[PDB]
Assembly symmetry: D2
């Protein structure tokens, strides 16, 4: 069962372009409002030689405000929970493969993540740390082989203006049989609120809202 | 100048998996409300042996409702007008390349379209006409090298359920200096209203509304 | 019937990055040795404002040396002949879509080609005529849905050294049911032998040989 | 220094579709003939719930027959050794991300491999163990930014005929400055010689020979 208030614990082990790191996060959030706050410490491989932004979207879709007219795959999936696998394909041919396991114990979700980035241009914006933020997005989700699949045309705002684009592919896998939703959208905004200079401590925010098209069928 | 009521003429010369066609349209629209309808006659290639859906997004973003806080790339471009180039990339590895030129004489927008589609599996949804409709969508639009570029995750709803995915990339090119918008989103719904069973005659409708994130910054 | 010696006529209508063109071609070759020569005249849109190398591979696998034990898809297809569709995807996101209809009247093959290119960066290798030649190549051919399909990792050698890569995908389609080959390979070399400085007049040569792996199976 | 006979030790940590595994290889090979064998034992995660064939090509290019006219990038890298990064991108949108380190102690090459596979369809041929073998291949190698890069059009033969395509991209990184080869080819054949039906015990063979085009220039 999910309360209007909930706690989040995150562990991430990763390698990006040969560099190894660990990240731990203590957080809270409001699942039914689609909002969450997360306090992240770089535990190993400080200082990071790449943009913290690439990591943020691997740092739960339980925290999405779902209209009643659209079945909530992620919330239904508990107490057993769900896992997801993501492919982040950037335009400079940098690739990240990410796997998260989402388990519940009491007031606290536990997020267990594996981050693999490689083939990022060394003089490119991720390894040169020129990303300011992710642009807010719209995930498209549908059913493929009894699973939920999300697709997002994503964009990072660069220092000096312009965008660096990433194609976002997630397969969400519930551990119990759940009621499948039809083709819907989720509006996101991912925001780093505070950080230190090495991004050794970061505070992260996420707002997610499930919807149908606002435009009338005919 | 663009009135509240404007007329639309459309010429399409096209080729899908070897088959050559010409489709003529007469239509009308409300540019500032972001809605329009088009009456489509197949002049050559009747009957068509592939889903009409693949042609529909090619059959003018002037018919996009633009809020005052976002500059309108498409309306500013007139009187000289604009052009666009598009790649549609399907999951079965069918592919379309499209080029459109948008002129304005008096109240009428003329659209000249060259449509190419190939490597569509012959037992694939498109050549078997097993596509019911396009899902509603959300195009993300950024400025790259002074031009406006859109990316859309798109899905066709098939018989038996299931969706058939496509990656939309558009490059829009004003034939004039115009004020350039910040990163923004256009929500879309395209639908076929009426058709004979050969789709030789089709009535097409589109609704398009531009916006920033509905979710607020923190 | 295909003789040791045959003639080749070539009509290509095209458009690259907005620039239209027409290229006529009379030529000859030895089908059973997989060698041929072609004399190429630019007839419209001279001089071409882009590298001629993109076009050359679109200017007939009938000129392939086929060992006894691999069926010859192309040669079998005649008299009725065959057609092909090709995708050229360049690493800088230039994209060419090409169709060729291959017919036989007497001892002369007619090749009717439609060539479409778009999204070549204006400062890019293709639009800045900075390519020397195609590296020789190995095509891989497999049967998919009762058609023959080819994939080639191709490279254009650049002025100043280094390579500009391009993923090659051809779908060949005989107009007759022919005996389908097993998975096999075609070794390629294509060469511009002679040209004037605007490439308005080009002499083109290709050598193609089909084989299995030379490596013994354990 | 490499001798006509050398030994191989392999430690692969891996996760495919969430299922983790460890494999230990002991094997031998003949570096200047391009031939090698391996004895593979699944030490964790037996039985593997996916096709073994996807793991086989990550289980040295030191064991490649290199002519004198083509510099040997991999044999020059020792005594210090080389690392490699690979992308395997399947047509069903399955993806593997691999990384290897090659060390030499005495007469034995130590290969340390990390394997990540994900978004493999659950009814797909990988997850349904329906892959008979890798077809023989021809890799194409060029220098990009003072590193050697490999591209292969790879196919798995499918039980019930037909093929399952993969795009291989490998970036090899010598840990010492070496002589850089010109654009060349390496012909490959990988073959599982013997296996228990669960594949917990597997014997592996690979042949690899470097060449130029066998077709004369003009």
């Amino acid at each position: 069962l999910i309360k209007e208030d909930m706690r989040v614990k995150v562990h991430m082990e990763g390698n990006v372009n040969g560099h190894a790191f660990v990240i731990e996060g203590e957080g809270k959030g409001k699942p039914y409002e689609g909002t969450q706050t997360l306090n992240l410490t770089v535990k190993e491989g400080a200082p990071l030689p790449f943009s913290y932004d690439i990591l943020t979207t691997a740092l739960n879709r339980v925290f999405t405000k779902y209209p009643e007219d659209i079945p909530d795959y992620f919330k239904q999936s508990f107490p057993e929970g769900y896992s997801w696998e993501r492919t982040m394909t950037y335009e400079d041919k940098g690739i990240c493969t990410i796997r998260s396991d989402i388990s519940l114990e009491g007031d606290c979700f536990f997020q267990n993540v594996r981050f693999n980035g490689m083939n990022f241009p060394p003089n490119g914006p991720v390894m040169q740390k020129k990303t300011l933020k992710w642009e807010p997005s719209t995930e498209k989700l549908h059913v493929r082989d009894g699973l939920l699949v999300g697709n997002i045309n994503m964009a990072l705002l660069l220092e000096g203006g312009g965008h660096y684009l990433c194609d976002f592919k997630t397969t969400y896998k519930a551990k119990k049989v759940v009621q499948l939703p039809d083709y819907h959208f989720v509006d996101h905004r991912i925001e780093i609120l505070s950080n230190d200079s090495d991004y050794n401590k970061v505070k992260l925010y996420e707002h997610g809202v499930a919807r149908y098209s606002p435009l009338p069928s005919q």
